[model samples]
Each structure stands twice: as structure tokens, then as C-alpha cells.
Target: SMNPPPPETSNPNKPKRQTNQLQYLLRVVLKTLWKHQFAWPFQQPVDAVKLNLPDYYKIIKTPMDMGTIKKRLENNYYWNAQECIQDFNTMFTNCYIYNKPGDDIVLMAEALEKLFLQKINELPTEE
Candidate 1:
């Protein structure tokens, strides 16, 4: 008779273990520090556009998704990731500054539009 398979030795209910690696934890620390000390240059000229008080006159707007941001950034508009990121930062900062009780979703869409306008102006003109 074939030897009986060795008795199972593994347990199935143990809690997953978390890592204490510095490499994993340092990213969060650095991001926090960077945001605190070197992240506001993108906020100047915050009035590039108004947040609310037009049309629906609603605060906070539809939030932007990464695909939409990237698509707009790389499509008939500016085609650089750096430009996109910078534009996004400005939009987000503006949103934060003007955010009100109901101005979350709507503000984001407004921000992207403002960024698009700002960037399109910077594109090189035909010689």
C-alpha cells in the first residue's frame, strides 16, 4: 500500500502578519513631510477660476478620475505626465482652498477645467 500522505501540518486560521520594514514605512513619512513643507507652490494664483456661483451655482463638483485626468492631459491637450501632475496638484490645492460643506464632487471637475485652460495657454504656438 502506498505510504499514507504525511499528516497535514499547516494551520489555516492564523492572522496575517504585518511588516515592520523601514522601506515600507518610510514612504508614508516622506509623503507627509513633503506635503507639509514643500507642497504649496502649486496653490498660488488660486483664483485662476471661481469654484462655485455659476449655472447650478453649486459647491464641490464631480471628482476627477485618473484616466480622465491622464486622457485630457495627453489628448488634444498637453502630452506630458509632468504637466498633468502639476496641473492636478494645482487643481487639488484650489479645490481644498475653496471647499465648502457641499463642494466636494463639483469642485474637482471645475479644477480640471481650470487646469486644462491654464495648460493649453502654455502649449507652444506654431511657428
Candidate 2:
């Protein structure tokens, strides 16, 4: 009955104004990922039963998705940039593991990761 936030299960840290210098950084990346046409397949958690991908569960030990990650971000579940980026890494890795080297999903994952990294790396920090 409740949809809530996660600022860490034991969050000693809050998003203070000064620390929010890097706040909008992730927001920008999130929007890019969300809007990309290649984003559809990986947008939500795969329903193995609904899609009958029981075999998908066999390989994807830890499953993740763009929308879920966005929830954590919006809920303040992340502590820093690396943790955020690492989850993105996990999301990408899980796809590669379940998919093949030349699969369409993998290609899109590669492209999205490339775009994400580029934005994160080169989007000059602002104040």
C-alpha cells in the first residue's frame, strides 16, 4: 500500500544542497537512456513467466533494468556516482551475459553504455 523512498536502508547521508553539484548529472544521463529508441527492451524487469523466459533466469543471476534504476535514483538509494554507474554496468553486463556477442540487445546495450559513459565523462560539471 505504500510507494516510498530508499535513501539507503540506514541513510546517514541526505542530498544536501552543496553536494548536489553532481545531482543533475545522473538526471541527464537517465533521460538520455529513457528517451533512446533502443531503450525499450531493457526498460523493465523481464517477466519470465509472462514471456516464458524461464531459461533467462538461469543465466541472469542478478537482474536489473532502466526503470528500476531510475526508481532508486529518485528514491535517493544511491550514495555516489560510482554506485550509480556500477548499477548501470551491472544492467549492461546482465544483458550481455543473457544475450550473445552480436545480438540486437547487446548492440543497443553497447550503444547505450557508450552514450552513457560519454555523457558522464564529457558533460562538464556545472555548479
Best by TM-score: 2
Off by over 4 Å in 1: 1-52, 55-68, 74-76, 101-127
Candidate 2 regions exceeding 4 Å error are 1-22, 123-127
Clashing pairs in 1: 59-103, 60-103, 60-104, 60-106, 60-107, 61-105, 61-106, 61-107, 62-105, 62-106
- For 2-106, candidate 1 gives per-residue lDDT tens digits of 222221223345222223222222233223322433333222222213533342213423332233333342232332334344544544544564456356444
- The alpha-carbon RMSD values of the candidates against the true structure, listed in the order shown, are 20.2, 5.1
Give residue 101's error in model 2 in angstroms.
Answer: 1.7
Residue 1 CA error for candidate 2 (Å)?
A: 26
The window of 10 residues in a row where model 2 has the poorest summed lDDT is: 1-10
TM-scores of the models, in the order given: 0.26, 0.77
Find the number of clashing residue pairs for candidate 2: 0
TM value for model 2: 0.77
Residue 60 lDDT in candidate 2: 77
| Model 2, position 10: C-alpha lDDT score | 28
